[PDB]
Design a protein around this ligand. Structure first.
Ligand SMILES: [Mg+2]
Ligand SMILES: [Mg+2]
Ligand SMILES: [Mg+2]
Ligand SMILES: [Mg+2]
Ligand SMILES: [Mg+2]
Ligand SMILES: [Mg+2]
Ligand SMILES: [Mg+2]
Ligand SMILES: [Mg+2]
Ligand SMILES: [Mg+2]
Ligand SMILES: [Mg+2]
Ligand SMILES: [Mg+2]
Ligand SMILES: [Mg+2]
Ligand SMILES: [Mg+2]
Ligand SMILES: [Mg+2]
Ligand SMILES: [Mg+2]
Ligand SMILES: [Mg+2]
Ligand SMILES: [Mg+2]
Ligand SMILES: [Mg+2]
Ligand SMILES: [Mg+2]
Ligand SMILES: [Mg+2]
Ligand SMILES: [Mg+2]
Ligand SMILES: [Mg+2]
Ligand SMILES: [Mg+2]
Ligand SMILES: [Mg+2]
Ligand SMILES: [Mg+2]
Ligand SMILES: [Mg+2]
Ligand SMILES: [Mg+2]
Lengths: 47, 179, 119, 81, 23
RNA sequence: GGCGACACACGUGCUACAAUGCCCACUACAAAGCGAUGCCACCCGGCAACGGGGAGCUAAUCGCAAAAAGGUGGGCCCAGUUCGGAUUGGGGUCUGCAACCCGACCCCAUGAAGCCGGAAUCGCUAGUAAUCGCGGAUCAGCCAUGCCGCGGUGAAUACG
RNA sequence: CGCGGGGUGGAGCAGCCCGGUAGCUCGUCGGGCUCAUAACCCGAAGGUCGUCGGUUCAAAUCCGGCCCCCGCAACCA
RNA sequence: GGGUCGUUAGCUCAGUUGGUAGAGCAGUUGACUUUUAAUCAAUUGGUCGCAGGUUCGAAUCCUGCACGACCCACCA
RNA sequence: GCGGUCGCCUCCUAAAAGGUAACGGAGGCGCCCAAAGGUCCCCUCAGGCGGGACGGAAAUCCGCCGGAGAGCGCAAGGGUA
């Protein structure tokens, strides 16, 4: 990426309805997740 | 340069696709280039300074500063002097493509009301697939206390797949919630 | 944080801020507040993610909510019509469904008045 | 509006339908009992109901489950103004 | 108000009894 | 079956648009008429409608009964908002031969218009108006917000 | 054949000229006051601008043709 | 192009200490009536040819320059 | 006479060089741009079909296809990726 004034994109951590989500790598690290349709209520693995 | 889904493509998505279609060459197997995100905004036209929240919060969720579209021709119905900015278009590749693409699949699409799955027919027949979003706050980096106003985008994803079949296969096996 | 769909409520009360979730209010609230044991008088701005997940999870699983619910309320309708049923006509072409009186004010179900002319 | 200990169906047609239900054959019977319930068992028949004026045929499905027999035989004429 | 069948003030108005106006 | 139609138009009213206000708990004060074909205290199940049971009174005895406002304490914090309950989905109660047309009520979900109403125009001179309940007739049930009545608290203003 | 102006809600006028949106009176519709009607008051509705091309980003608006309309003219012979 | 002159919060204006800021029809409010009026009675700052430069201060003087109204002249 | 016209550009007329007339057929000019100029370096159209939130034939984005039908400030012709 061309060098100057452009978001950092540093490894991060995020959650789910179940436990954590790994891969991450986001600028503005450490965010939060209400729901996951793959942790999966609310779609997959139906109900 | 690591990026879990990138890895999961090479180890376990690639071979499943070789077993399934079968391939003389390592190259023929569909690879994944260029997920390009485009916000068409009339939403900011005569006021073009509304843009740069929508541009800065684009770069926040992709991790890349978008460039700015402008107007092909002048169309009188909505405004549209041949000059003005319509929206942002950011091209994503290579890691930075995946780093965003996994965050898309583990977070974004979960966070939509409903989400009965991704429409299966959006493959363009030459074996790319694009879709479109509304509330940008389905993303992690968007807190709904940073939203001035909602606007979506159109996400196109391109693939070295020559056909639509293999397009869905590549995307399914990358864990694309589908129908 | 947020309930089914998104529907973030905030500040004010918790029991109160629950009505602002669709498919819920008063009754379906004050009870699901004890069934998580959470204080109803709590102020949804301040409270522990503890209380949130036990509340967010209870509600999202328990009963059908708008993303799913509104889909289903509409679903009875297209069935209540398209069958040929009576209420289905009052739906089909858009008049009041349960008894009542159409000679004078329907106004809610009828829209605003389109006036014409006398004898 | 329920009954429940109840579920009233006039026995004019109820006999004819239960006899048509297990019959071997079916055609259209014409009743005045719209005050009935319809089914659980009546489904699949054509039946001519009455509006005050004449006898209207009704094809029957399960979407017609509990719905009293005349919801499907309307009493009015409109076509607007 | 006196028209909410879900309130005390309302049921009193109609004259009826319920979970919001038990006898 | 209709009298219950609905592009519309007028009349009479009810509930309202909120903080002298709404919601919850607790505690208090009436008059009048009805009712042993009925009114059902009281126990039980039911969130509840109501269903059970069941005691009393031809009733200054026993029952409808709860009066409401208020009073007290607590909550709401000026929001189309805990205002407001129209509309609609769903679940049941009961009357009745039967509740689709077309019933009343309970609960769940839904929460609409409406932020004091254009030209106009109504009532009221005192225990009146406003506002708050309650009874009765008709009646199986009920579309009563009606009408006939009853007490509760209780203004303003008349130069002329 | 000739030169000039015009065709816009039911009527009568603006707007065209200077591209971007259509206005004014009357009529009409709903309400008001009245025993009632007019008068009067409060509200509203209603049109693609003769037509057909073209121009432009956009045409009642600018250009060409045609269709009507009104006006002037047609003299020495 | 010369000469005079302007120049004004919605509009017209009316203001040359260096102070504020209006006076009329307008707009809203509010009495009055019926109708139309006519009378009455209530307002934010709106940093007033434009940037500059005079001073204790300039809507508010001085050069600038954009403009307008007026008037003279002249046009191979 | 009245009407029209009167200079300049483009197209035909014009007879395959030039030129060429009529009150022959058709249109345009009396400007515009301090970038719409110089140069260096990039870039390649219109259109059609599929795809894709609010996007509809037309805003933007993504594919294939597209040798010039686009663009070149304005008329026509020549020219031109
Ligand atoms: Mg491809
Ligand atoms: Mg009714
Ligand atoms: Mg309420
Ligand atoms: Mg009240
Ligand atoms: Mg009838
Ligand atoms: Mg009648
Ligand atoms: Mg009716
Ligand atoms: Mg009424
Ligand atoms: Mg109990
Ligand atoms: Mg005695
Ligand atoms: Mg009683
Ligand atoms: Mg509203
Ligand atoms: Mg009123
Ligand atoms: Mg008197
Ligand atoms: Mg009563
Ligand atoms: Mg126009
Ligand atoms: Mg009239
Ligand atoms: Mg002569
Ligand atoms: Mg001449
Ligand atoms: Mg001449
Ligand atoms: Mg030649
Ligand atoms: Mg030659
Ligand atoms: Mg050039
Ligand atoms: Mg194209
Ligand atoms: Mg397309
Ligand atoms: Mg070309
Ligand atoms: Mg050419």
């Amino acid at each position: 990426m061309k060098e100057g004034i452009h978001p950092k994109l540093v490894p991060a951590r995020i959650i789910c309805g179940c436990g954590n989500v790994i891969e991450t790598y986001s600028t503005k690290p450490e965010i939060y997740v209400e729901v996951c349709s793959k942790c999966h209520p609310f779609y997959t693995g139906q109900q | 340069l690591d990026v879990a889904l990138k890895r999961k493509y090479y180890e376990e998505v690639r071979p499943e696709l070789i077993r399934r279609f079968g391939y003389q060459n390592v190259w023929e197997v569909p690879r994944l280039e260029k997920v390009v995100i485009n916000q068409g905004l009339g939403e900011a036209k005569e006021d073009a300074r509304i843009l740069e929240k929508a541009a800065q919060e684009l770069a926040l969720i992709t991790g890349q500063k978008p460039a700015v579209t402008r107007a092909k021709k002048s169309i009188s119905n909505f405004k549209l002097r041949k000059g003005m900015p319509i929206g942002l278009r950011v091209t994503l590749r290579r890691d930075r493509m995946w780093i965003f693409l996994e965050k898309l699949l583990n977070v974004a699409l979960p966070r939509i009301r409903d989400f009965r799955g991704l429409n299966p027919n959006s493959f363009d027949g030459r074996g790319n697939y694009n879709l479109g979003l509304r509330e940008q706050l389905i993303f992690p980096e968007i807190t709904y206390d940073m939203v001035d106003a909602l606007r979506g985008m159109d996400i196109a994803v391109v693939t070295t797949a020559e056909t639509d079949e293999e397009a869905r296969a590549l995307l399914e096996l990358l864990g694309f919630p589908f129908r | 944080a947020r309930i089914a769909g998104v529907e973030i409520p905030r500040n004010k009360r918790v029991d109160v801020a629950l009505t602002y979730i669709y498919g819920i209010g008063k009754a379906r609230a004050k009870e699901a507040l004890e069934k998580t044991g959470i204080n109803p008088a709590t102020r949804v701005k301040d409270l522990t993610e503890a209380e949130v997940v036990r509340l967010r999870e209870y509600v999202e699983n328990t009963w059908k909510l708008e993303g799913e619910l509104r889909a289903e309320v509409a679903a009875n309708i297209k069935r209540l019509m398209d069958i040929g049923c009576y209420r289905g006509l009052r739906h089909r072409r858009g008049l009041p469904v349960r008894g009542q009186r159409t000679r004078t004010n329907a106004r809610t179900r009828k829209g605003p008045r389109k006036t014409v002319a006398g004898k | 509006r329920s009954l429940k200990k109840g579920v009233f169906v006039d026995d004019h047609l109820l006999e004819k339908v239960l006899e048509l239900n297990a019959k071997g054959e079916k055609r259209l019977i014409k009743t005045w009992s719209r005050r009935s319930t319809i089914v659980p068992e009546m489904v699949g028949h054509t039946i001519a109901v009455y509006n005050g004026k004449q006898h209207v045929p009704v094809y029957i499905t399960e979407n017609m489950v509990g719905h009293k027999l005349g919801e499907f035989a309307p009493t009015r004429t409109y076509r607007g103004h | 108000g006196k028209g909410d069948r879900r309130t005390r003030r309302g049921k009193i108005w109609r004259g009826t009894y319920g979970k919001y106006r038990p006898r």
